[PDB]
Amino acid sequence: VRTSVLHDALNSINNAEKMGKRQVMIRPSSKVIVKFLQVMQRHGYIGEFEEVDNHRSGKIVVQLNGRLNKCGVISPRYNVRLAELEKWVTKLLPARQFGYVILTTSAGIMDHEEARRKHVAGKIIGFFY
């Protein structure tokens, strides 16, 4: 059964982008999904998205503009200290100059670079570059 709605949304986006389409539909919508898209949007990797509201859960229609290589999710949400954050960027990021690792902390979910500025840590939930 459906055990991770976040994985379903990210997987569906990846398939459509690789085949060259421009728009995607996501059937279930949640707060974590929307908060994840906003981080991607502020860096220019996607365009506008709109959430139609049926009374069950709503849907999302995202607009693609290329520029996106992969977006994945880590299924067991490990606990990561602030001191060991440099291990992960070496593992699942193509290069040091660009790419982002998404975390969830007590101050909202955020990328791995602003969290260093605010000196905060938490749990890891995904990545995109």
Partner: protein
């Protein structure tokens, strides 16, 4: 694929690795300590013994020669083994009741080359050293 992946499944993963680790052959012989029990050497590197007789051993099928092994009884536990005498014309240096010292071929319990069923070689005779006698660096005591 098919492993448990949850955050509270550390017991199953640890148990599974312990069980399947026995299928390895190198680890299985280490855990059971077969060398301490079955090997003629008590898990050591060398051993001393007494020579009983001189025996010739035929080479394997493609080759044809006489390998000129020797029979030895170990002082430590009284077991009997066979050992190979290296170099050319060295049986002439060994007599009966000569207190030889042995070692392995380095294949770690397996026969080396075409010699069948031989796992040891003679290193010293009468406490002089075989190779030193071959090059006439020393004279065998009487």
């Amino acid at each position: 694929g098919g492993k448990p992946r949850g955050l509270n499944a550390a017991r199953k993963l640890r148990n599974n690795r312990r069980e399947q680790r026995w299928a390895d052959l190198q680890y299985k012989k280490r855990a059971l300590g077969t060398a301490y029990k079955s090997s003629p050497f008590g898990g050591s590197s060398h051993a001393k013994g007494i020579v009983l007789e001189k025996v010739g051993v035929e080479a394997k099928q493609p080759n044809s020669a006489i390998r000129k092994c020797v029979r030895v009884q170990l002082i430590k536990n009284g077991k009997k083994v066979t050992a190979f005498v290296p170099n050319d014309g060295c049986l002439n240096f060994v007599d009966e009741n000569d207190e030889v010292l042995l070692a392995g071929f380095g294949r770690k319990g397996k026969a080396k080359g075409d010699i069948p069923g031989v796992r040891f070689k003679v290193v010293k005779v009468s406490g002089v050293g075989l190779l030193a006698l071959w090059k006439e660096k020393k004279e065998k005591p009487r």
